[PDB]
Amino acid sequence: SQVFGVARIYASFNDTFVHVTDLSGKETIARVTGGMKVKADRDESSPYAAMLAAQDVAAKCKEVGITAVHVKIRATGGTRTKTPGPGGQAALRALARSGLRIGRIEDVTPVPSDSTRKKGGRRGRRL
RNA sequence: UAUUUUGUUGGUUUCUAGGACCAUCGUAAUGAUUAAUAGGGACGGUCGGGGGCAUCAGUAUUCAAUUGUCAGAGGUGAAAU
Ligand SMILES: [Mg+2]
Numbered sequence: 192s193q194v195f196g197v198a199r200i201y202a203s204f205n206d207t208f209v210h211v212t213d214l215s216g217k218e219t220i221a222r223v224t225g226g227m228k229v230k231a232d233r234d235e236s237s238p239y240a241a242m243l244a245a246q247d248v249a250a251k252c253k254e255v256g257i258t259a260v261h262v263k264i265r266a267t268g269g270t271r272t273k274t275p276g277p278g279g280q281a282a283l284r285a286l287a288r289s290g291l292r293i294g295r296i297e298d299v300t301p302v303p304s305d306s307t308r309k310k311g312g313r314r315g316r317r318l
Numbered sequence: 319u320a321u322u323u324u325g326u327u328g329g330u331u332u333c334u335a336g337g338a339c340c341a342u343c344g345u346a347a348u349g350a351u352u353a354a355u356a357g358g359g360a361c362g363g364u365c366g367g368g369g370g371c372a373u374c375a376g377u378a379u380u381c382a383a384u385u386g387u388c389a390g391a392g393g394u395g396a397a398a399u
């Protein structure tokens with residue numbers, strides 16, 4: 192049968208993390224980010240650097256033995272936006288298209304039961 | 319109270335001066351307005367994120383301990399700290 196890992200795509204703004212672990216989550220198999228793949232440090236959040244991160248993560252899942260993966264897409268959460276950034280779906284498309292098999296897609300963004308006053312003041316972040 | 323009379327005031331003075339019995343020989347329809355689409359109170363089943371005290375839970379955040387992994391991570395319009 193297939194051997195499953197967990198993809199654990201933290202797609203924030205300003206960066207994307209593709210982090211395959213084992214089924215327990217305690218062993219890391221190729222955490223690769225977008226700033227490892229682009230040198231402009233605004234394109235870390237871009238769909239392009241997510242694609243190059245996810246394809247090399249998929250290229251290290253093979254030679255280790257991971258053939259299929261559960262994905263855990265994940266925005267910043269907490270007091271932040273709760274909206275996954277521009278590279279989550281690009282990382283998902285690349286990791287699905289680069290030889291791995293996918294099952295059990297879920298979103299795991301950390302949501303409070305309202306807690307911990309948001310950063311920015313009362314008038315907000317005014318530009 | 320006698321005002322009029324008996325021995326000038328004077329006690330008892332008189333079927334005539336009281337609230338005490340009511341004593342014309344004890345009568346009356348005997349005597350308390352509603353119940354405000356005012357108010358207050360009570361009662362009934364309720365209703366509510368009304369209040370106080372105690373208690374319970376939830377993730378999130380921050381930090382810590384253990385763990386795995388390896389060059390970036392944060393952050394922005396772009397940066398830099
Ligand atoms: Mg602020």
Ligand SMILES: [Mg+2]
Nearest residue numbers: 315316317318
């Ligand atoms: Mg404006």
